[PDB]
Write a structure and sequence with these properties.
The structure is a monomer. The protein has about 250 residues and is an alpha+beta fold. The chain has one domain (about 5-65, about 80-245). Helix content is about 40%, strand content about 10%. It has a four-stranded antiparallel sheet. The two termini are about 30 Å apart. Belongs to the Cif family.
C-alpha cells in the first residue's frame, strides 16, 4: 500500500550495500540463469573459479590469458548481467526463471502492453533495446509509477554508471510512462535527434544531463524487445534479504 515506496527503497538500498561483501557479490552477479538465484552457493561458485584457474596453470597465467582480470575480484556487472540477475531476484520464488529463455514481445508498444496489466499486481519489465545496445529494467509497483534499474559499462550512447550509484541517486525517482512509451516504440529510431537525446538523458542518465549522452552511437536499425513478469513484493524482499544477509 502507501508504505510500498519506502520499503521498496529500503530493500534496494540494503541489497546494494551488501554487494561489497564477497559472497553477496558472488551470488548476486553469477551468470547461471537456469537455477534459482537464492540457490546459488558462494563456495561452490568460488570452487569453480579455483578450478578454472587451476585449468589455466595458476592465477597469474589465468589473468595473463584472459585480459588481466582477477576472477576472484568483486564484480561490476555489465548491463545484461545486472538486468538478468535483478529480474531473477525480483520475480523468483521456488521455480527458476531464465530471463535469457523467456518469451519477449517485439511488435507491441509499451503503452499497449502496460494498459493490459493488472493494476493490482506488481510487474517488472526486462527491456532489450537493440537501438541503444542496452538492457535495463522497468519496475511497475502495484497501484501509475515506473522506476528504472540498470547498470552500464559505457561505450554506447549512455555514460557508464554503476548499479549502486544509479540506485542511490535515482532508484526511487519515478519516470514518465509516456516518455517510456515514446522510448519503447518502433518509431523512436526515426525521431528528431534532439528528441532522442531528450528521452535518453531523462530516463537513463543519473544527472539527466543531455550533454552526457551521445546519440551518434545509437544503432538506428536495432530491434526492440521486452518482457514483463508479475512479482510478489514480499517475495522480492525475502530474496533481496537472503542475498544481503550473506
Amino acid at each position: 500500500l502507501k508504505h510500498r515506496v519506502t520499503l521498496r527503497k529500503a530493500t534496494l538500498a540494503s541489497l546494494m550495500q551488501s554487494l561489497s561483501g564477497e559472497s553477496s557479490n558472488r551470488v548476486m552477479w553469477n551468470d547461471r540463469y537456469d537455477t534459482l538465484l537464492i540457490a546459488r552457493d558462494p563456495r561452490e561458485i568460488k570452487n569453480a573459479i579455483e578450478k578454472s584457474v587451476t585449468d589455466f596453470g595458476g592465477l597469474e597465467n589465468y589473468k595473463e590469458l584472459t585480459g588481466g582480470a582477477d576472477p576472484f575480484a568483486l564484480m561490476t556487472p555489465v548491463c545484461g548481467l545486472s538486468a538478468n540477475n535483478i529480474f531473477k531476484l525480483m520475480t523468483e520464488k521456488d521455480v527458476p526463471i531464465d530471463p535469457t529463455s523467456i518469451e519477449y514481445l517485439e511488435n507491441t508498444s509499451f503503452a499497449e502492453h502496460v494498459n493490459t496489466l493488472d493494476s493490482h499486481k506488481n510487474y517488472v519489465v526486462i527491456v532489450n533495446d537493440g537501438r541503444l545496445g542496452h538492457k535495463f529494467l522497468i519496475d511497475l509497483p502495484a497501484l501509475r509509477t515506473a522506476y528504472i534499474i540498470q547498470s552500464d559499462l559505457g561505450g554506447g550512447a549512455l555514460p557508464a554508471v554503476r548499479v549502486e550509484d544509479w540506485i542511490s541517486r535515482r532508484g526511487s525517482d519515478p519516470v514518465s510512462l509516456d516518455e517510456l512509451n515514446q522510448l519503447l516504440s518502433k518509431d523512436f529510431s526515426k525521431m528528431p535527434d534532439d528528441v532522442q537525446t531528450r528521452l535518453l538523458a531523462s530516463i537513463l542518465q543519473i544527472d539527466k544531463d543531455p550533454h552526457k549522452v551521445d546519440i551518434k552511437k545509437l544503432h538506428l536499425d536495432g530491434k526492440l524487445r521486452f518482457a514483463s513478469h508479475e512479482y510478489d513484493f514480499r517475495q522480492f524482499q525475502r530474496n533481496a534479504q537472503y542475498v544481503a544477509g550473506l
